[PDB]
Amino acid sequence: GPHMATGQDRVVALVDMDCFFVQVEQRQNPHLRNKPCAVVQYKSWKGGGIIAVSYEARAFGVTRSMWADDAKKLCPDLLLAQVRESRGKANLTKYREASVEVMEIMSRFAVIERASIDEAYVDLTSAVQERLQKLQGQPISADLLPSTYIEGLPQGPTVQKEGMRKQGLFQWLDSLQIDNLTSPDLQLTVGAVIVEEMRAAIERETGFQCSAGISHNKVLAKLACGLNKPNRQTLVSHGSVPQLFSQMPIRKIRSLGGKLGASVIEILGIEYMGELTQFTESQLQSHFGEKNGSWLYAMCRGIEHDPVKPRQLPKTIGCSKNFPGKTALATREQVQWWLLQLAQELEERLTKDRNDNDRVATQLVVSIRVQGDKRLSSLRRCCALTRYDAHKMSHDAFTVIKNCNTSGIQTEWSPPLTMLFLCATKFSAS
DNA sequence: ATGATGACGCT
DNA sequence: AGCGTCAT
Ligand SMILES: Nc1ccn([C@@H]2O[C@H](COP(=O)(O)OP(=O)(O)OP(=O)(O)O)[C@@H](O)C2(F)F)c(=O)n1
Ligand SMILES: [Ca+2]
Ligand SMILES: [K+]
DSSP, rough: OOTTSSSSSOOEEEEEEETHHHHHHHHHHHGGSSOEEEEEEEEETTEEEEEEEHHHHTTTTTTTTTTTHHHHOTOOOOOOOEEETTTTOOOOHHHHHHHHHHHHHHHTTTOOOEETTTEEEOOOOOHHHHHHHHHHSOOOOOGGGTEEEEETTTTOOSSHHHHHHHHHHHHHTTOOOOTTTTHHHHHHHHHHHHHHHHHHHHHHHOOOOOOEEEESHHHHHHHHHTSSSSOEEEOOOSSTTHHHHHHHHHGGGGTTTSSHHHHHHHHHHHOOOGGGGGSOOOHHHHHHHHHHHHHHHHHTTOOOOOOOOOSSSSOOEEEEOOGGGGOOOEEEHHHHHHHHHHHHHHHHHHHHHHHHHHHEEEEEEEEETTTTOSSEEEEEEEOOOOOOOOOHHHEEEEHHGGGGGGOOSSSEEEEEEEEEEEEEEEEEEE
């Protein structure tokens, strides 16, 4: 009872750009705005692979991974924008630079953790304490929360979507104890006000819309963010967790979408995250290990402690290209030419990074895949990265992979290579 | 023949 | 270090 921690100590938000690469292309080309459209890479093989999809196009069934030729069968008027191609490969620079625009706006409000090109976690605990002191116990108006959903409401004793949203918000705000400065529900609500302001600033200063989740930890914030997209935000309170989790498939929780979650389902014979509450901590640790078991015991009760790490920049800078089916590299000269292409893009991104961010990479990771393996990587080897020079990096990568060549002939490469990857890691300040 | 990324855990 | 898992 009085000593049972409830995981209500932080206010954490997750901000996610809606269909991000599509928004970047629609900002640049107004002809694409408010249309079914997608971003594709390459074009020769079946129209290119779709990597991002506008919500108008999702209504027709267009998804990521689809070939554009097939997407066109579902949506004949689908508009397409192509990823830039440089040195024979996809170049994502435009989207990395757009992400920096958004991340720098977010950093004005709070320290952020860059989770991906288009996602950032925000720890709002301190910002919320300050805003509460500025209020001094004045109520929070619904006008301060114009795009916020309160998960689980309305409830209890209109048929339109915005009407539903406002009924739920009204019930939430009418129940709020605004005199208690340490009420977790109040803290979440103030967090949501700040996230409304953050999202307004992102849209004003970049043109990009996003969704967001606000809760007490990263897993609940990510789950919340997904509940109402696009261009909306959702508050998931601690009290909403039992009902929410009672029908939540286990695979929807971050880190449980793969083999571990499938094993939770198979071993325990359950389907929903709330069903985990019926096991002891020791039972869960016995099945899934000490760390995973403790994590599952707390997480199915809405409790998680993973911190929002203060990190706005990526930790690695990598360049990779697949060579599928018949295009697999079968000669020494082919392998050197593509290693050089990758190393030239890498050198350009590293030089830009060292000028912008005052750091240098010190380790070069080289990874390859051979025709036949089912694993995404067949071999990974590191060497020293001492100069930002593409010819040296490609020579060193070749040196650390050249003994993989099964061929007895010097000029041939067997088994042919279906993937090349160069990654700069282990940054030091400079 | 999805592809091109990127973070973190295990041993 | 090198390999694997999970995710955008
Ligand atoms: N497998 C993937 C997943 C994503 N992305 C790239 O990562 C970006 C963001 O990934 P997101 O958040 O998962 O999906 P969204 O497009 O933003 O759509 P939503 O509104 O539902 O958030 C994509 O634009 C991308 F461009 F598509 C990718 O390259 N490969
Ligand atoms: Ca997104
Ligand atoms: K995302």
